[PDB]
Structure 1
């Protein structure tokens, strides 16, 4: 029986309307209010376009949804509404639908993002500390609001490097946290899935996002995108084991009385733990400070209960300069 070490009773103490997203009655706006300029992205659940609000002539992002169940769509919407206004949380501006097809679109604020594949390599030591701190503000906020993002990855972190503005986007996989509830482990993305998902531990919590965050952080400081380059879910777990070592994995599995599928156990095998410094090189040396390593190490732990919470992460000495600059 696992539960979150923080914010566990958030949804318990709030009115049922807050988390009972299926009781949501969607209020639709006018679909002609937003004109499509051009496609900018996509997902297996939608098509994303740069658009313009015909009212104020301001930019916006139009996320057109592919056939999706009523329940699933109400969840994303409710979550977006519950979080609207929080630190660095993407803003849902409108909700429209095509009358004939019933194709729904979610209208969001626009961010002049730069492909992380091109942006990250240019980020300075301080830039990394800065943006990660900004992302942390978003995570602690949603967690404090009883919500797990469940899909943290560079692709869901929009960044306008010029304005140094950051937004955590796409809450399509997010869920409300309820103590003891068993969730679907088919969430998050390849490379960023936490061990709990890879070993089928369903009663996970906000800590899942902290593993994803750690993967992101590791890729940034080590200049290796992605950090854990695995193919399928079994392989993804093996890639983690060859770094963190199988001892931690075994201890982890034992603590939660989890038994791996025979085939998987065979693939994982036996591996020793590889120090984080083994990943340092002339390409990333100017980023692998001991503080960076200490922070990373406290994020990438098999045991989700051992990981730093977002609140704790923000106070780590690694961010001391970012904070000092903010508290002034």
Structure 2
């Protein structure tokens, strides 16, 4: 398998663009940034609101727990390569404390609201807007030869008053090289695409579109996480109990994949459940024919059949936001 879009971006860039192990980090001065308060704990990073003591601007400080220097360099190189892209978090500095040498990334601050608080206050056209903004970030990173690999609400910061969206946490992101066999232990369980769950290692940007689909289903149906498996095997089972096993078997045959025997037994046999089955009185105001059609075109087993991010932006679901922003670029 090879990506059907942005296939060859990395050979159209100098070697130094993607060869992150060769990066030499130019460290800033740690004493320029003061921690103000904690905002979150990740598995191996800690995130603080900070202040730049020189220009007094707010910032976010991400302190990275030891992981291979290869991984720190990968995250830094990706953030540098994506700097200035639409709805991408902006990396402002790279510092480390004098004594422990633990690295910290300095970002531009975003006034986020927790999705558990924010999403219940979003109406139909708010969802259309923010998904469109997320698609702009994914199309951009894909166009620059990068797959995020951890798309989920927790990695999408939103300043709702300023309608500002930033795609964050590039620590699992990778460069796409056609033919490359990647680690399938990426993303977070509930957002993993079927390719990861069946050990299809030569996956591509389209992984991120499955993850987006999961996020989107969770929003419009108010069922989050939408696919709630108790382990990586059961994650496939939860997907198969919605999409059905007939489509799974077609997919496995196309890509010449032999399903693990234990996994095959766990998946069993299931009919496809129509998307309308998830509609209820509480969520119905968020569902339209256009939302269902868009969702259906994201959540497909076959990664090569999913909408790309740029194709998604053309879908009728986004008619209004697309027309509104096109007007402003004309005025520019």
Q: TM-score higher than 0.5 here?
A: yes
The alignment's C-alpha RMSD in Å is 0.6
- How many Å apart are 1:91 and its aligned residue? 0.3
Q: Deviations over 1:239-294 (max 9, x none)?
A: 00000000000111111111111111111000000000000000111111000000
Q: Deviations over 1:112-164 (max 9, x none)?
A: 10000111111010000000000000000000000000000000000011111
Q: Distance in 2 between matches of 1:112 and 1:231?
A: 33
- How many Å apart are 1:230 and its aligned residue? 1.3
Q: Distance in 2 between matches of 1:224 and 1:325?
A: 30
Unpaired runs of 5+ residues, structure 1, are none
* Structure 1, 50-59 or 240-249: larger mean CA deviation: 50-59
- Give the structure 2 partner of residue 12 of structure 1: 11
- How many Å apart are 1:12 and its aligned residue? 1.1
Q: Matched residue of 2:116: which SS?
A: helix
- How many Å apart are 1:50 and its aligned residue? 0.7
Q: Distance in 1 between matches of 2:326 and 2:180?
A: 38
How many residues align? The count is: 327
- How many Å apart are 1:30 and its aligned residue? 0.3
Q: Distance in 2 between matches of 1:93 and 1:63?
A: 12
Unpaired runs of 5+ residues, structure 2, are 328-332
Q: Deviations over 1:204-239 (max 9, x none)?
A: 000000000000010111111111111110111100
Q: Matched residue of 1:186: which SS?
A: coil
- How many Å apart are 1:78 and its aligned residue? 0.2
Q: Distance in 1 between matches of 2:76 and 2:197?
A: 28
Q: TM-score, normalised by structure 2?
A: 0.98
Q: Distance in 2 between matches of 1:58 and 1:100?
A: 26
- How many Å apart are 1:187 and its aligned residue? 0.2
Please list every run of at least 4 consecutive aligned residues from structure 1 whose deviation after the TM superposition is greater than 3 angstroms. none
In the TM superposition, what are the counterparts of 1:279-290 in structure 2 within 5 Å?
279-290=278-289
In the TM superposition, what are the counterparts of 1:1-328 in structure 2 within 5 Å?
2-328=1-327
- How many Å apart are 1:81 and its aligned residue? 0.1
Q: Deviations over 1:89-119 (max 9, x none)?
A: 0000000001211110000111110000111
Q: Deviations over 1:162-220 (max 9, x none)?
A: 11100000000000000010000000002100000000100000000000000001011
Q: Distance in 1 between matches of 2:289 and 2:156?
A: 26
Q: Matched residue of 2:190: which SS?
A: coil
Q: Distance in 2 between matches of 1:260 and 1:294?
A: 29
* Structure 1, 257-266 or 214-223: larger mean CA deviation: 257-266
Q: Distance in 2 between matches of 1:171 and 1:285?
A: 34
Q: Matched residue of 2:40: which SS?
A: strand
Q: Matched residue of 2:189: which SS?
A: coil
Q: Matched residue of 1:49: which SS?
A: strand
